[PDB]
Amino acid sequence: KVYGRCELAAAMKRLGLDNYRGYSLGNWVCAAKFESNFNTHATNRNTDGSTDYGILQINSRWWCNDGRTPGSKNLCNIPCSALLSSDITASVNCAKKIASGGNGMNAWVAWRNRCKGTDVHAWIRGCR
């Protein structure tokens, strides 16, 4: 799947992501095109023996299982798969918990690349 920006972003609101660890959802939204381009089934394999997955584009060897990655942890104890689904909320639910770490959006430098220091409400406006 691949979700439409607004069609998708008030969905995060549903998850209250907005102000998840003080994080405005636009910042979240962003990461999705930048790290997800809002594609549910988009998944990027690394030259590090693993792929980030989902739209979230998070690394398996630390979070999910696709039974593939040598020495992977899957601390999410879940399917790497269950996330690229045309309904990301699941991955979201895991991604969200994953921010419980100190680092924050930092873990998506792509975020720090784009989403960091940027006008995140630039997403919010003109969509209910």
Label the pairing between strands 52-53 and 64-65.
unpaired
Whole-angstrom Cα distance, residue 74 to residue 58?
A: 11
Beta bridge partner(s), residue 58? 53
- Stated in angstroms to one decimal place, the resolution of this structure is 3.3
Q: Is residue 93 classed as helix, strand or coil in its secondary structure?
A: helix
Q: In the annotation, is 7 catalytic? A: no
List the catalytic residue out of 7, 48, 52, 66. Answer: 52
Whole-angstrom Cα distance, residue 55 to residue 26?
A: 15
List the catalytic residue out of 35, 48, 66, 119. Answer: 35
Q: Is residue 68 classed as helix, strand or coil in its secondary structure?
A: coil
First to last CA, the chain: 22
- Check: CB of residue 3 under 8 Å from CB of residue 88: yes
Burial tier of 7 (Cβ tally within 10 Å: 0-12, 13-18, 19+): exposed
Domains and CATH numbers, the chain: 1-128 (1.10.530.10)
Structure token pair of residue 120: 């995140």
